[PDB]
């Protein structure tokens, strides 16, 4: 019930002012366009996927590469890091998701599983644990797989459009996905049915990510308007838009406390908003192309951004 607005509720709160984040790292070594990323729970190891058929696992602290996997196919657009750091996954338009095991053989790498059978492209694939994984298929359905068995252990139906993105709750029991129907849908990963659906958008939901408390999420549209939604509200809580530039949003993610919400546009920049007062808290610039994904460490010390420029940037 939109009896008021968040700005009215947070009126008595002063803005954080101009947020100034610095560049701590410049991860070079990628040969082609980067399409995804995921932090490990140790905030030290991260996974990056690029169209050169490569999945590279980098150590954030020491700037050096720890692992490099040559993929079967060059159309990867999503990758996820296992919370325990034992597994990685990749996949894309090939309707096949390849999963590799890390702490079984070191130095080299093994393709522990290949998930084939999808009728739609993989737009996002996400770990839940060392044995479960959720993949986004553009056939208006998603799929929950068990890596050890390789089957579509569950199918997610209810969307009427090509699913672009998803994100798990911080506790990895619930995930919200957006499709071409300009609507977002909340799902229980074990139950997989469309509980709440959010409409009103003019284009596909090109970005979606969860709030650290697992009670709210964000959406990105083509008209440069980032939107904040609550799980239970079934309506948008804040709109963060600029009229002068018409490029869409690509990725979203929140700060550890959630005072700060990050969202990148095709205008070569990312904007970080004071989530409380819709204030344009700061701008992150430096990517040599459009931003493709970004994330925050589970402990919240630093943010990583991966873009089409083939370089990852870490900000503190």
């Amino acid at each position: 019930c939109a009896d008021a607005t968040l700005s009215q509720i947070t009126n008595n709160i002063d803005p954080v002012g101009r947020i100034q984040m610095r560049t701590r790292r410049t991860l070079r070594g990628h040969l082609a366009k980067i399409y995804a990323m995921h932090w490990g729970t140790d905030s030290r190891l991260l996974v990056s996927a690029s169209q050169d058929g490569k999945l590279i696992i980098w150590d954030s602290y020491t700037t050096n590469k720890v692992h490099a996997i040559p993929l079967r196919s060059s159309w990867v657009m999503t990758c996820a890091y296992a919370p325990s750091g034992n597994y990685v996954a990749c996949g894309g338009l090939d309707n096949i998701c390849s999963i590799y095991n890390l702490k079984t053989r070191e130095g080299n790498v093994r393709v522990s599983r290949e998930l084939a059978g999808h009728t739609g492209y993989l737009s996002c694939c996400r770990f839940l644990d060392d044995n479960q994984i959720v993949t986004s298929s553009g056939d208006t359905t998603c799929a929950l797989w068990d890596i050890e068995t390789g089957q579509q252990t569950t199918t997610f139906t209810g969307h009427t459009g090509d699913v672009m993105s998803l994100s798990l709750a911080p506790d990895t029991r619930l995930f919200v996905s957006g499709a071409c129907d300009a609507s977002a849908k909340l799902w229980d990963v074990r139950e997989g049915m469309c509980r709440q659906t959010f409409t009103g958008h003019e284009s596909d939901i090109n970005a979606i990510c969860f709030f650290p408390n697992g009670n709210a999420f964000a959406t990105g549209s083509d008209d440069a308007t980032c939107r904040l939604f609550d799980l239970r509200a079934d309506q948008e809580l804040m709109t963060y838009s600029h009229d002068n530039i018409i490029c869409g949003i690509t990725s979203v993610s929140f700060s550890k406390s959630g005072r700060l919400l990050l969202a990148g546009y095709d205008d070569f920049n990312c904007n970080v908003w004071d989530a409380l007062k819709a204030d344009r808290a700061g701008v992150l610039a430096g990517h040599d192309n459009r931003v493709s994904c970004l994330g925050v460490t589970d402990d919240g010390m630093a943010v990583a951004t991966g873009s089409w420029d083939s370089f990852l940037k870490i900000w503190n």
Epitope: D14, P15, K277, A278, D279, R280
Partner: antibody
Framework: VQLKESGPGLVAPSQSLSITCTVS????????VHWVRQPPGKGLEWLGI???????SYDSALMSRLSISKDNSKSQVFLKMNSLQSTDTAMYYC?????????????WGQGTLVTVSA | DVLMTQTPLSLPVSLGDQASISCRSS???????????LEWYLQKPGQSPKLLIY???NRFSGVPDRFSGSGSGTDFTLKISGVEAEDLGVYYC?????????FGGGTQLEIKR
């Protein structure tokens, strides 16, 4: 830095008032703009502020009837105030906020008297 | 809901004399980042207010040095070193720490003859 205001001198009661305080000498995306009205022969009253990034803070009494919006490209900030009353007869001032001076309103608008009468 | 109560309410001051205008809020005010915002505005009759002291004690560019800004905690004071013809008007102390921000009640400074 100069703030110049323009608005309708006479407005009918309960209608919508559109006041423009076109700013100059600074980037509107980095400074706040204030609204203060002064009834004839009385002390000042506080209305609200839009912050540098577009966030808004209003007087606790006047969130519902006051609206502050801006076009950053044109250096134009617009006050939309609805449900006007006779008590709204006042010299409405737009005041700048400078972060570098830490909440000091260096520059105030010249003010335009607005009359709510038949 | 802090209120700036200003004293003295109306004090006749001769030319060249020094005058003390102190205002104390209904509650102790400090910004959450550690700053305190007391600003003194001189308003001529019917004109827009003009800032004199920003950040409690710092004079703004163009503000005459004959105005002395100081004070701490709940006590703040603007002192005038030499009173000229341009000293006529009303003086308000302003707080910018807790919203909704509030102005002082205004001090009627008058010139004797």
């Amino acid at each position: 830095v100069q703030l110049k205001e323009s608005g309708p001198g006479l407005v009918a009661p309960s209608q919508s008032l559109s006041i423009t305080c076109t700013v100059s000498g600074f980037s509107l995306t980095n400074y706040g703009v204030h609204w203060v009205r002064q009834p004839p022969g009385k002390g000042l009253e506080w209305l609200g502020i839009i912050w540098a990034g577009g966030g808004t803070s209003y007087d606790s009494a006047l969130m519902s009837r006051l609206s502050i919006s801006k076009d950053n490209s044109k250096s134009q900030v617009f006050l939309k105030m609805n449900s006007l009353q006779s008590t709204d007869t006042a010299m409405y001032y737009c005041a700048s906020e400078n972060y570098s001076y830490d909440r000091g309103f260096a520059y105030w608008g010249q003010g335009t008297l607005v009359t709510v009468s038949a | 809901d802090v209120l700036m109560t200003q004293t003295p309410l109306s004090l006749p001051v001769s030319l060249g004399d020094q005058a003390s205008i102190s205002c104390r809020s209904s509650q102790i005010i400090v910004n959450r980042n550690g700053n305190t915002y007391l600003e003194w505005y001189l308003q001529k009759p019917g004109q827009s207010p003009k800032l004199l002291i920003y950040k409690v004690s710092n004079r703004f560019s163009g503000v005459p040095d004959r105005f002395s800004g100081s004070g701490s905690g709940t006590d703040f004071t603007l002192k005038i070193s030499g009173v000229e013809a341009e000293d006529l008007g009303v003086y308000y102390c302003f707080q910018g720490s807790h919203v909704p921000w509030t102005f002082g009640g205004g001090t009627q400074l008058e010139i004797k003859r």
